Amino acid sequence: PALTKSQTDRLEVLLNPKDEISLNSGKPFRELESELLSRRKKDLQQIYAEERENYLGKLEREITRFFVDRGFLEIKSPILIPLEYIERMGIDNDTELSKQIFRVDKNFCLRPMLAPNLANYLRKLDRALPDPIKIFEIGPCYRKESDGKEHLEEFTMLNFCQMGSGCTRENLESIITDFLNHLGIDFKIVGDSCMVFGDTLDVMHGDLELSSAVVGPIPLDREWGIDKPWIGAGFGLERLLKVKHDFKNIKRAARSGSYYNGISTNL
Amino acid sequence: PALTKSQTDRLEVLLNPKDEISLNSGKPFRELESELLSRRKKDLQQIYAEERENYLGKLEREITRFFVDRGFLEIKSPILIPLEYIERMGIDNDTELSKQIFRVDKNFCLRPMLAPNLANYLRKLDRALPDPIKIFEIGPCYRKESDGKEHLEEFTMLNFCQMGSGCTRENLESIITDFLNHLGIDFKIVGDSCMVFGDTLDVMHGDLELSSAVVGPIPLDREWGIDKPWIGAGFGLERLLKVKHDFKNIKRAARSGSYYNGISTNL
Numbered sequence: 165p166a167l168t169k170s171q172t173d174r175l176e177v178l179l180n181p182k183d184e185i186s187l188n189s190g191k192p193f194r195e196l197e198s199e200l201l202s203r204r205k206k207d208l209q210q211i212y213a214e215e216r217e218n219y220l221g222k223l224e225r226e227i228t229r230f231f232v233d234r235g236f237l238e239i240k241s242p243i244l245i246p247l248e249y250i251e252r253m254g255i256d257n258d259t260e261l262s263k264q265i266f267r268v269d270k271n272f273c274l275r276p277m278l279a280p281n282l283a284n285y286l287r288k289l290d291r292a293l294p295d296p297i298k299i300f301e302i303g304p305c306y307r308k309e310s311d312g313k314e315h316l317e318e319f320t321m322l323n324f325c326q327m328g329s330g331c332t333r334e335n336l337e338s339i340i341t342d343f344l345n346h347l348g349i350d351f352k353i354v355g356d357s358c359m360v361f362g363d364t365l366d367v368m369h370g371d372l373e374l375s376s377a378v379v380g381p382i383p384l385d386r387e388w389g390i391d392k393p394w395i396g397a398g399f400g401l402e403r404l405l406k407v408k409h410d411f412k413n414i415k416r417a418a419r420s421g422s423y424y425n426g427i428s429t430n431l
Numbered sequence: 432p433a434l435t436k437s438q439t440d441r442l443e444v445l446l447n448p449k450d451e452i453s454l455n456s457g458k459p460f461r462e463l464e465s466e467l468l469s470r471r472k473k474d475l476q477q478i479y480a481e482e483r484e485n486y487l488g489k490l491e492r493e494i495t496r497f498f499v500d501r502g503f504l505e506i507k508s509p510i511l512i513p514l515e516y517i518e519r520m521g522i523d524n525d526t527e528l529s530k531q532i533f534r535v536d537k538n539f540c541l542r543p544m545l546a547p548n549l550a551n552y553l554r555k556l557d558r559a560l561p562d563p564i565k566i567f568e569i570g571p572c573y574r575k576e577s578d579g580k581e582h583l584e585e586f587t588m589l590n591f592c593q594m595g596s597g598c599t600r601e602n603l604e605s606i607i608t609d610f611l612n613h614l615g616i617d618f619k620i621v622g623d624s625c626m627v628f629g630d631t632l633d634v635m636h637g638d639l640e641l642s643s644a645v646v647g648p649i650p651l652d653r654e655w656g657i658d659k660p661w662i663g664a665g666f667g668l669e670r671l672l673k674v675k676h677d678f679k680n681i682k683r684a685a686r687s688g689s690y691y692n693g694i695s696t697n698l
């Protein structure tokens with residue numbers, strides 16, 4: 165008995181990283197599907213009985229506590245933003261990131277990153293708060309993607325940043341190290357570059373990019389009224405969850421009607 | 432010395448409910464503005480030094496703990512949804528709620544409510560979880576609005592719901608009473624009606640609608656594969672914050688670059 169592509173795809177939906185089941189051992193599809201359906205129902209019943217917290221919600225809460233306790237102000241800024249912020253961030257009207265923007269109406273878009281709203285907060289808060297200014301945000305961001313195992317069109321970003329004193333590469337690396345040590349995630353730092361910010365310190369878990377981080381100043385600062393040293397980093401929460409839970413596909417971690425805490429809801 | 436409309440508007444931005452300052456006492460605008468700027472800087476410095484949590488984030492966390500502890504599963508579902516869900520909810524292509532939808536691309540929109548995603552979860556979870564099924568979600572929703580003192584175009588909804596046993600008007604009212612007692616908010620229940628769900632139990636704080644709640648079944652259920660009794664209610668978090676903090680305008684409570692925890696960021 166050989167399994168079709170449709171049958172293999174169904175069993176993959178129902179399989180979880182903790183299982184050790186051979187799909188092509190010769191056991192018939194009916195028995196493999198029944199076994200995995202029972203395991204997944206049991207898993208969902210246990211979540212309902214004992215935890216009840218959503219992985220993305222819980223991780224946002226965990227990250228929020230970490231940064232609040234370290235002196236960063238928690239921001240919740242608009243997800244629907246002016247389309248003018250795109251050109252103003254140096255996302256040239258050519259393509260790459262520009263073709264990835266979801267437009268809303270004629271003058272708005274869904275934010276593809278948190279940085280512009282955070283830059284506006286740094287500028288405004290510097291007129292009232294003592295040095296250094298430390299803020300962060302966690303929330304939804306949106307990009308059109310070719311959709312692989314590591315990209316979502318609707319994902320969740322953390323961006324923390326600081327402006328004023330202490331905005332050095334060593335302090336940025338120290339914050340990233342404390343943060344990922346808190347989550348229990350091994351990493352290395354590798355140099356990369358991007359169109360918006362220039363040179364980045366990319367935080368890698370193996371071949372998976374968890375974050376890009378930047379040490380300012382950069383030429384873009386003038387356009388946003390930023391006139392002091394700064395440091396910042398952006399992380400994808402679903403990528404963090406993919407590492408934490410050993411998911412093969414980031415879709416297990418996404419906002420979704422198709423998975424609850426990585427368990428298929430098609431049972 | 433009389434104040435212009437622009438000067439009055441500026442002082443209103445800087446005024447907070449706890450102040451007792453007459454804007455038109457005859458004191459010159461320069462002194463009223465300087466006094467309010469100092470108070471607001473002091474307020475923001477105190478938040479930065481001692482709390483650091485965003486009002487909307489904190490309230491979402493408080494509400495999440497309440498519902499998780501009462502047996503409801505925490506959901507985080509897509510904000511960008513299929514445009515087909517609009518017609519399928521009975522939002523007729525005429526207008527009213529239909530003209531309020533933000534469209535994205537050609538086949539998507541920003542969700543104007545949480546209900547359709549929650550209906551899909553109830554249906555799917557009923558195939559694996561024991562009766563009754565209890566779930567909730569908190570997150571952003573979007574509607575085009577004439578924009579008054581009680582409406583935002585980008586707001587935050589809580590919707591909790593239950594399907595199976597216990598889906599009575601008395602139990603729905605009991606949950607609403609426990610919830611608003613937990614937040615310390617007085618209310619009454621008044622009947623109303625809406626195009627989507629029919630008769631609603633509206634939760635009122637004075638003339639302010641905090642929620643619409645529904646006791647099913649309703650004719651819409653068949654289109655969503657819902658085939659059991661159910662109850663549910665939707666609340667706006669920014670309206671809850673407006674009551675809690677005595678804000679004159681709901682914009683003080685919104686996701687915004689213009690206010691932080693109700694304090695102007697234009698200082």
Ligand SMILES: Nc1ncnc2c1ncn2[C@@H]1O[C@H](COP(=O)(O)OP(=O)(O)OP(=O)(O)O)[C@@H](O)[C@H]1O
Nearest residue numbers: 307309314315316319373374375376398399400403
């Ligand atoms: N489409 C996406 N889905 C999930 N997470 C994402 C996506 N795009 C970015 N992120 C996360 O946000 C972080 C910061 O965004 P950044 O602009 O640096 O991404 P990126 O360099 O375009 O990532 P990649 O090179 O993997 O596309 C990334 O390191 C990643 O963790």
Ligand SMILES: Nc1ncnc2c1ncn2[C@@H]1O[C@H](COP(=O)(O)OP(=O)(O)OP(=O)(O)O)[C@@H](O)[C@H]1O
Nearest residue numbers: 574576581582583586640641642643665666667670
């Ligand atoms: N544009 C908005 N801004 C802020 N909160 C809102 C908005 N629309 C709805 N809500 C909140 O969501 C809850 C449930 O949504 P519902 O569809 O019942 O609103 P609604 O009846 O259209 O409210 P209203 O009659 O005030 O426009 C409302 O009771 C309200 O608390």
Ligand SMILES: N[C@@H](CCCCNC(=O)OCc1ccccc1Br)C(=O)O
Nearest residue numbers: 277279283325376384385388390396398
């Ligand atoms: N990995 C993230 C890294 C974001 C870092 C930016 N965070 C910030 O604090 O703003 C500083 C800023 C100043 C001036 C002009 C523009 C800007 Br932006 C990303 O590429 O999405």
Ligand SMILES: N[C@@H](CCCCNC(=O)OCc1ccccc1Br)C(=O)O
Nearest residue numbers: 544546550592643651652655657663665
């Ligand atoms: N005040 C909120 C009240 C929402 C209650 C709905 N919540 C739910 O659980 O779904 C049940 C459901 C079943 C079948 C077909 C459609 C649907 Br929807 C609002 O009007 O936004």
Ligand SMILES: [Mg+2]
Nearest residue numbers: 261307309315
């Ligand atoms: Mg990319």
Ligand SMILES: [Mg+2]
Nearest residue numbers: 356366373376
């Ligand atoms: Mg990259």
Ligand SMILES: [Mg+2]
Nearest residue numbers: 358373375376
């Ligand atoms: Mg990057």
Ligand SMILES: [Mg+2]
Nearest residue numbers: 528574576582
């Ligand atoms: Mg309305």
Ligand SMILES: [Mg+2]
Nearest residue numbers: 623633640643
């Ligand atoms: Mg109403």
Ligand SMILES: [Mg+2]
Nearest residue numbers: 625640642643
């Ligand atoms: Mg209503």
